[PDB]
Amino acid sequence: VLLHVLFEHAVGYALLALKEVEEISLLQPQVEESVLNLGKFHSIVRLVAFCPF
Amino acid sequence: VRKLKFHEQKLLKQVDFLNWEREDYTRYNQLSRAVRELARRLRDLPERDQFRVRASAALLDKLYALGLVPTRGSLELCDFVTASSFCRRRLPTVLLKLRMAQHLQAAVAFVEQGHVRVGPDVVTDPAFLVTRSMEDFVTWVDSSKIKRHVLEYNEERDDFDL
Amino acid sequence: AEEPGFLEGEDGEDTAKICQADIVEAVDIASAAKHFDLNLRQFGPYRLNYSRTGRHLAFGGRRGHVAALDWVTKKLMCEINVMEAVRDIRFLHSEALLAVAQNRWLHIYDNQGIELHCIRRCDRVTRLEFLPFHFLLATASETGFLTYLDVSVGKIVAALNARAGRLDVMSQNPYNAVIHLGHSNGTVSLWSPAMKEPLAKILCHRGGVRAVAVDSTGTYMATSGLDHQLKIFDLRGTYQPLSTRTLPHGAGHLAFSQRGLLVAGMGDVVNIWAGQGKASPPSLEQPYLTHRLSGPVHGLQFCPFEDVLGVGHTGGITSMLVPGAGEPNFDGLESNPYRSRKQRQEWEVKALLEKVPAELICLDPRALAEVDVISLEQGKKEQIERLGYDPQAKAPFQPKPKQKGRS
Amino acid sequence: MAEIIQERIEDRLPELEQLERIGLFSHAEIKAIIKKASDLEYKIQRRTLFKEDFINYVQYEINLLELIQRRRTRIGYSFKKDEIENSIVHRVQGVFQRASAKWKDDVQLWLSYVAFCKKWATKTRLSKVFSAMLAIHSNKPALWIMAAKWEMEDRLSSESARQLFLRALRFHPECPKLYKEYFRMELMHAEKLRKEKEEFSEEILKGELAWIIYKNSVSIIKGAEFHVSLLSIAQLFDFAKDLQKEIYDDLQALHTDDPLTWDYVARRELEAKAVEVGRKEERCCAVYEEAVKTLPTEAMWKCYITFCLERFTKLRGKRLERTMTVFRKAHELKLLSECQYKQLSVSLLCYNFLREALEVAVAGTELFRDSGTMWQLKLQVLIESKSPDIAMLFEEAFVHLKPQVCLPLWISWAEWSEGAKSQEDTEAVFKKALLAVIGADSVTLKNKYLDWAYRSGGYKKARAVFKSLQESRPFSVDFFRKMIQFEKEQESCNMANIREYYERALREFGSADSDLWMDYMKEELNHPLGRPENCGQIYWRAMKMLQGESAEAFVAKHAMHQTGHL
Amino acid sequence: KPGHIINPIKAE
Amino acid sequence: MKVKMLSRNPDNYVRETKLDLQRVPRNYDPALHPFEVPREYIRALNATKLERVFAKPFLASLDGHRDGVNCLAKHPEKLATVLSGACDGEVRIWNLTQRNCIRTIQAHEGFVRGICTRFCGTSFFTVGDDKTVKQWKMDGPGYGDEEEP
């Protein structure tokens, strides 16, 4: 499930890398904290590139 | 100890002995148990036994005299005696019934300084059951500051009687 | 990170004649503050107990004076008057709970002086001792009974009749978790809550046994008796006397430190033997340190992780300095002197979840690993007694009522 | 918690026990390292993290690496680099990676990571560090150059340096700094190939590959300065005179109507003997008027005047007539601005030439009648010439200056009137000045009025002037400090007057002046007529009136005074 | 790995 | 006489700030940690008890077929996409993350007896009782257009 996401913002373009994630149970009360909590989010998502306007 | 989590409580049902960091009602419960258990035995004797008649009459008049029983009756009322009946016969709460005091802590406080006497004798023990006969003869001790206030309010103070 | 202390004389000096005053001036001010002399003459001779973590000390007087205190800092946690004689004092798995052996029953107190439980079953108890990892408190009584109490639940798991007369000499093996009892027969008895009879009896003295102690490793046993003998026994399957010496008087009290030093309590005089201890018992040839108390000794114990020895006597309580007695490096998770309240309450929950059941106490702590070979009918018999009934037995046949002429 | 800390210490053990086996470190020294490493480990494994603890952890290992290196030389032991040095280096890289992830925006942390990788790490490791930094910091042109510099000078790969430069210009199409360094690196590449042939395509060797950079960059950046800048790097290399010749020719042809290009041609011509120095200068001049006919703008003119002064201040008579004609010639064209009028006149005055400076002064006044600065410039000239026209100067100057606020002119008139006019006229000038100037500029006027009164008159004259001016509120502390000094010089030294002057000054500036309060307190002690017991109430009054930092400054100053440091 | 598809073994 | 005593320096053992965490020295002497065999037996017994408490296998049930399910096929490239076929002849595509049906097609008359996906994942194949083999596109039809094999 290693993949790259492109995020567009008013400040610039952001390129991010995803390491691993529980895809099937993502929208479940305990597993959903993987993206809601900042500490858990940092463990699975990294910022690889950024280009401001 | 510390508050147990969900999984810990399943493993340890209770640790109440070590679970650390308003009145006992222990002796009254033992006496209430002895009376009720004695009522069971006498109920089991044959209904026309003369021993049953004498023992039950002797037991039930004793309870009536001390005030644990409201009215003259059979062994049916004998199963209603509890810790509440014993607590109602204490000296401070009798003062509260007689309107000599309005609060329990005030009623208790009057006792130890010695403002309250049961007949000639002065009683300082709050744990003291007063009989129905003795209840008629509880009053303020003489030469007490409370009795002065009662006489002053009634405009009946007489200094010859001290 | 730490190294044990030492004490060597020079130019042929004997360490026995060195007094406590010489030691205090020659060591740093922090250690010098650990040497003090409490003077309590009005009430009776005192028995003392150190908390399993060396921070806390509790003591009890014969006349009924009981106080618990932090001893490192000089603060008093509680000081109360129990209204009758006191024979022994012990902590219960922490500094929070105190058990006192009063004249008539056994009582449980808070470290602030609040009474918690009064056990009516345990009566006329002379000696107390606590098994930490099983949460069991063991009592020896005047009437001749040995009782085990589960403090975790509050129930008496076993009550054993020793049937040997008065019980006054008791100790435990920390490695083994068995109880040792001395007798006037000259014999020492080994007990476990599972059995109704002693595990073993060992003849040790030609007279009555007056004191008994075992090391932390569970390897050596030290005993003294009226025959004026100090004996060291090998508990590792041999039960033979390794060393023997003659004394002016039988040792009233004995103890072992965590590094293997042995101390003898003789009247008003305390004597300490030290040995290399590396797979060897201490040497009884010549003492390591000596001291003379103001009154006859009534209790001895080494602080767990410090180089101090606690002595209780008629005059009061004194603290000796014993360089090299305490174990230097402690584990922060099992017994931390420098632990916060939140660290403490996390530790106790871990221990409570981890309690060892009483029946598992045996002479071998690793016996559960061994595979027992027994006959099939042997297992069938043993299942019956433990349960009281056969769970596979078939009840006699009773026909069911049926219709169409079958009722 | 410590289980991670205990995790990391056990990993450090195998290299430490090897250091004991070699004999480099003693067993006690091994204990000290473990203890200090544990303390640093606790700081970086907390829930609350600071940037300083990571730096302290990294700096400790670097110091440990140096101590090992120095001891290995004395023993002459060179084995076991992998078990010891590579273990420590790998551990430091993990700390930098964790820190760089936490604080991405800090360039100083990134550069510290790069500096460590150069000294101690593999070149393939340093390659990742540059790429990671450039990924999030691509908007800084200087960081691109640092990576390209390392590939060229250190890794010796011209190809990798070329792609680094070319990509950088795609991120920064308009950056002149990137083009110049790209221009230099290709010319640096040609020099390397020239040396290669001597040791053993031709178009590359000629510098054509750098010529493509010049042609395209000039088209994107249409600036004369960038064109001149490119020629400078081309000159620095001995080869490719044709490239220098080509750019120089395009400079005049493409860039005209700009003064900078014409100036560059003139200064190149600069690059018996006094005569030989001479006819260069007229040839340089001959270029200058040639630019004047082609480009008659004001900007080109000043470049010719400013050239003339530089030769003069650097024979002195010979340089002078060139300045004379060009100053005159610009003057009828009226293109010359006010600033250069002053610069010539001041330059002439320093070299004792007093007749031209008047002509410069007169020309400025006629051109810019309102400018009071030129009037001061003219005023300085006539005093130097000693001409008897100073009185006529002031009458003309003030009528031309319709604005009332001309502070230097009023001061100069009072100064001149003292020297060569009666006492009463000096007072008349001072009183007129105080009427014209009313605001904060009156502060300097009042001080000079008081100073004149003491010198023209005596103490009595100063007292009369002080009494008249004591109610005109715009003041300075120098007004009261001067009057206090005058009272001290007199033989009487009335202590009542000294306190009276201090109270008036403290009423105006007591809220902010810590020095004035300290001076008042020292007066009561040191003066023979002073009353030292008043110092208690002065300190109490000073603390309440002073506000903010001034109050705390007074406390420090008084504490210094109690000791001998004063 | 929690989100990665596991493919059968291939010769290598 | 020469002597030192056991005197712990408090700075080594006490944390320095409130932001700091408590220090935990560890000693693995077996004398300090007895009863290792009975102790770990209790820990193992607790773990088995908690495993029985926390066993909750059922997650969700997907509804929408009007006859019994007969075929299942998972998507080679995507974990959350599965294909199913019922006895009435319809084929349904499901999203496992959302637990809903994405598409419904009337693939066959009678049962659908099998379904397989092309390894690239852009098509799948089905077989029914009408003696037919049909190839479909994994991507859904655009707008309201009826889906065509």
Dump the DSSP string for C298-356: EEEEE-TTSSEEEEEESSEEEEEE-TT-S-S---TTTS-TT--HHHHHHHHHHHHTTPP
What does this entry list as its resolution, in Å?
Answer: 2.7
Residues on chain C touching D2 (C-beta within 8 angstroms)? 332
Tokens of D207: 């510098």
Instruction: Provide the β-strand partners of residue C202.
Output: C188
Quote the CA–CA distance of D134 and D104 in Å, as a whole number. Answer: 11
Quote the CA–CA distance of D431 and D434 in Å, as a whole number. Answer: 5
Quote the CA–CA distance of A28 and A19 in Å, as a whole number. Answer: 20
CB neighbour class for B21 (10 Å; exposed up to 12, middle 13-18, buried from 19): exposed
The torsion angles phi and psi of D204, rounded to 5 degrees, stand at -65, -40
- Contact between B68 and B74 under an 8 Å Cβ cutoff? The reply is no
Q: List chains adjacent to chain E, taking adjacency as at least 3 C-beta pairs closer than 8 Å.
A: A, F
- Contact between C208 and C165 under an 8 Å Cβ cutoff? The reply is no
Tokens of D70: 């120095």
Across the interface, of D101, D104, D139, the residue whose CB is closest to A52 is D139
Quote the CA–CA distance of F24 and C338 in Å, as a whole number. Answer: 9
Sign of CA dihedral D524, D529, D531, D537: negative
Distance from CA of F89 to the nearest CA of B (A): 49
Q: Backbone dihedral region of F141: left (phi > 0), alpha (psi from -120 to 50 degrees) or beta? A: beta
Return the half-sphere exposure (C-beta side, CA atoms, 13 A cut-off) of residue D449: 27
Looking at this protein, which amino acid is placed at residue C79?
E
Q: Of D460, D136, D185, D523, which is closest to residue A14 (Cα–Cα)? A: D136
Q: Of D289, D288, D353, which is closest to residue D316 (Cα–Cα)? A: D353
Query: CB-based contacts of C324: which residues, under 8 Å, 6+ apart?
Result: C4, C5, C6, C7, C259, C261, C274, C307, F6
Angle at D57 between CA D53 and CA D59, to 5 degrees: 115
Tokens of D282: 């007229």
Sign of CA dihedral B141, B143, B145, B147: positive
Q: What is the DSSP string of D497-537?
A: HHHHHHHHHHHHHTTT-HHHHHHHHHHHHHSTT--GGGHHH
Query: CB-based contacts of D513: which residues, under 8 Å, 6+ apart?
Result: D477, D550
Angle at B100 between CA B152 and CA B65, to 5 degrees: 140
Pure H helices in D437-512 = 442-456, 459-469, 477-489, 495-509
Quote the CA–CA distance of F36 and D83 in Å, as a whole number. Answer: 36
Return the half-sphere exposure (C-beta side, CA atoms, 13 A cut-off) of residue D264: 17
**What are the Cα distances from residue A43, in Å, to A17, A39, D96?**
11, 7, 17
What are the strands, taking DSSP E only, across chain B? 116-118, 121-122, 138-140
**Does chain F touch chain B (at least 3 C-beta pairs within 8 Å)?**
yes
Q: Of C157, C120, C124, C154, which is closest to residue C140 (Cα–Cα)? A: C124
- Contact between C97 and C77 under an 8 Å Cβ cutoff? The reply is no
DSSP helix, strand, coil percent of chain F (3-state; round to 5): 15, 30, 55
DSSP F33: S
Query: CB-based contacts of B39: which residues, under 8 Å, 6+ apart?
Result: B59, B75, B78, B79
Sign of CA dihedral D30, D36, D39, D45: negative
Continuous segment of H or E residues that includes residue B57:
helix B50-66
Pure H helices in D401-458 = 407-420, 423-436, 442-456
**What are the Cα distances from residue D483, in Å, to B81, D288, D415, D470?**
107, 60, 21, 11
Tokens of D563: 């000791």
Other Cβ atoms within 10 Å of F127 Cβ, number: 19
Instruction: Provide the β-strand partners of residue C139.
Output: C128, C147
Q: Of B29, B132, B32, B26, which is closest to residue B80 (Cα–Cα)? A: B32
Distance from CA of F119 to the nearest CA of D (A): 36
Other Cβ atoms within 10 Å of D250 Cβ, number: 15
What is the widest separation between alpha-carbon atoms in chain B? 78
Return the half-sphere exposure (C-beta side, CA atoms, 13 A cut-off) of residue D103: 17
F26 contacts chain D (CB < 8 A): yes
Distance from CA of B20 to the nearest CA of F (A): 25
- Contact between C64 and C100 under an 8 Å Cβ cutoff? The reply is no
Please give the order of strands across the beta sheet that includes B116-118: B121-122, B116-118, B138-140
- The residue whose two tokens read 């005209």 is D256
What are the strands, taking DSSP E only, across C25-96? 37-39, 46-50, 56-61, 65-70, 75-81, 86-91
Distance of CA C75 to the CA centre of its chain: 26
Contact C97 B20 (CB under 8 A): yes
Continuous segment of H or E residues that includes residue B76:
none
Strand-pair category, C220-225 with C200-203: unpaired
Quote the CA–CA distance of C136 and C130 in Å, as a whole number. Answer: 6
- Contact between D87 and D15 under an 8 Å Cβ cutoff? The reply is yes
Distance from CA of F74 to the nearest CA of B (A): 37
The chain A residues in contact with chain D (CB within 8 A) are 46-52
Tokens of D306: 């400013």
Q: Of C349, C219, C262, which is closest to residue F34 (Cα–Cα)? A: C219
Strand-pair category, C155-161 with C170-172: unpaired
Other Cβ atoms within 10 Å of F82 Cβ, number: 17
- Contact between C281 and C232 under an 8 Å Cβ cutoff? The reply is yes
Q: Of C29, C19, C6, C2, which is closest to residue C261 (Cα–Cα)? A: C6
B17 contacts chain C (CB < 8 A): yes
Distance from CA of D143 to the nearest CA of A (A): 15
Q: Backbone dihedral region of F146: left (phi > 0), alpha (psi from -120 to 50 degrees) or beta? A: beta
Query: CB-based contacts of C232: which residues, under 8 Å, 6+ apart?
Result: C220, C221, C222, C241, C242, C243, C244, C281, C282, C284
- Contact between F36 and F44 under an 8 Å Cβ cutoff? The reply is no
Contact E2 A21 (CB under 8 A): yes
Return the half-sphere exposure (C-beta side, CA atoms, 13 A cut-off) of residue F16: 7
Minimal-distance CA residue of chain B relative to C117: B17
Continuous segment of H or E residues that includes residue A50:
strand A45-52
Please report how the helices D2-22 and D81-102 are oriented relative to each other, as an axis angle in degrees rounded to 10. Answer: 150
Three-class SS of B131-160: CHHHHCCEEECCCCHHHHHHHHHCCCCCHH
Residues on chain F touching E3 (C-beta within 8 angstroms)? 79
**What are the Cα distances from residue C400, in Å, to C392, C397, C403, C406, F84?**
22, 9, 10, 9, 53
Tokens of D383: 């005093």
Sign of CA dihedral F5, F10, F11, F13: positive
- Contact between C77 and C69 under an 8 Å Cβ cutoff? The reply is yes
Strand-pair category, F133-137 with F123-128: antiparallel
Tokens of F93: 């595509």
D48 contacts chain F (CB < 8 A): yes
- The residue whose two tokens read 């202590």 is D495
The torsion angles phi and psi of D194, rounded to 5 degrees, stand at -65, -40
C336 contacts chain F (CB < 8 A): yes
D46 contacts chain F (CB < 8 A): yes
Quote the CA–CA distance of F146 and D506 in Å, as a whole number. Answer: 97
Instruction: Provide the β-strand partners of residue A46.
Output: A17
Other Cβ atoms within 10 Å of D441 Cβ, number: 15
Quote the CA–CA distance of F147 and F140 in Å, as a whole number. Answer: 8
Question: After which residues do gaps appear in chain C, with C to N over 2.5 Å?
Answer: none
Other Cβ atoms within 10 Å of C127 Cβ, number: 21
**Does chain F touch chain A (at least 3 C-beta pairs within 8 Å)?**
yes
Please report how the helices D372-385 and D390-400 are oriented relative to each other, as an axis angle in degrees rounded to 10. Answer: 180
- Contact between C94 and C51 under an 8 Å Cβ cutoff? The reply is yes
Continuous segment of H or E residues that includes residue C181:
strand C179-182
DSSP reduced 3-state for D63: helix
Tokens of C176: 């083994």
Sign of CA dihedral A4, A5, A6, A9: negative
Sign of CA dihedral D161, D163, D169, D172: negative
Other Cβ atoms within 10 Å of F10 Cβ, number: 9
**What are the Cα distances from residue D386, in Å, to B79, D364, D379, D380?**
137, 20, 11, 10
Quote the CA–CA distance of D289 and D300 in Å, as a whole number. Answer: 10
Tokens of C52: 């399993």
Strand-pair category, C6-8 with C46-50: unpaired
CB neighbour class for D268 (10 Å; exposed up to 12, middle 13-18, buried from 19): exposed
Quote the CA–CA distance of C83 and C96 in Å, as a whole number. Answer: 22
Tokens of B6: 């969900």
Angle at D97 between CA D92 and CA D100, to 5 degrees: 120
Q: Of D427, D489, D428, D504, which is closest to residue D458 (Cα–Cα)? A: D489
Strand-pair category, C289-292 with C269-273: antiparallel
Contact F20 D6 (CB under 8 A): no
Tokens of C332: 């922060």
Return the half-sphere exposure (C-beta side, CA atoms, 13 A cut-off) of residue C250: 16
Question: After which residues do gaps appear in chain E, with C to N over 2.5 Å?
Answer: none
Q: Of C134, C65, C125, which is closest to residue C93 (Cα–Cα)? A: C134
Distance from CA of D96 to the nearest CA of C (A): 29
CB neighbour class for C317 (10 Å; exposed up to 12, middle 13-18, buried from 19): buried
Quote the CA–CA distance of D280 and D286 in Å, as a whole number. Answer: 9
DSSP reduced 3-state for F105: strand
Contact C345 B14 (CB under 8 A): no
Query: CB-based contacts of D138: which residues, under 8 Å, 6+ apart?
Result: A51, D144, D171
Contact F24 D35 (CB under 8 A): no
- Contact between C288 and C272 under an 8 Å Cβ cutoff? The reply is yes
Sign of CA dihedral C275, C279, C280, C281: positive
Tokens of F29: 């002497």
Instruction: Provide the β-strand partners of residue C189.
Output: C181, C201
Quote the CA–CA distance of D40 and F16 in Å, as a whole number. Answer: 12
Contact A22 E2 (CB under 8 A): yes
DSSP B34: H
Through-space distance between the first and last CA atoms of chain E, rounded to whole angstroms? 21
Q: What is the DSSP string of D356-398?
A: HHHHHHHHHHHH-SS-HHHHHHHHHHHHHHT-TTHHHHHHHHH
Strand-pair category, C297-302 with C155-161: unpaired
Residues on chain B touching C116 (C-beta within 8 angstroms)? 20
Rg of chain B in Å (alpha carbons): 23
Quote the CA–CA distance of F112 and F119 in Å, as a whole number. Answer: 21
Minimal-distance CA residue of chain F relative to D35: F12
Looking at this protein, which amino acid is placed at residue B146?
I
DSSP reduced 3-state for C138: strand
Rg of chain E in Å (alpha carbons): 9
Q: Of C366, C333, C330, C357, which is closest to residue C347 (Cα–Cα)? A: C333
Other Cβ atoms within 10 Å of C39 Cβ, number: 10
Q: List chains adjacent to chain F, taking adjacency as at least 3 C-beta pairs closer than 8 Å.
A: A, B, C, D, E
Q: Of D369, D362, D452, D376, which is closest to residue D408 (Cα–Cα)? A: D376
- Contact between C96 and B20 under an 8 Å Cβ cutoff? The reply is yes
Q: Write b or e for each residue in C381-402: b if 16 or more Cβ atoms lie within 10 A of its Cβ, otherwise e.
A: eeeeeeeeeeeeeeeeeeeeee
Q: Of C292, C287, C293, which is closest to residue C274 (Cα–Cα)? A: C287
E7 contacts chain A (CB < 8 A): no
Residues on chain A touching F98 (C-beta within 8 angstroms)? 27
Quote the CA–CA distance of D19 and D33 in Å, as a whole number. Answer: 12
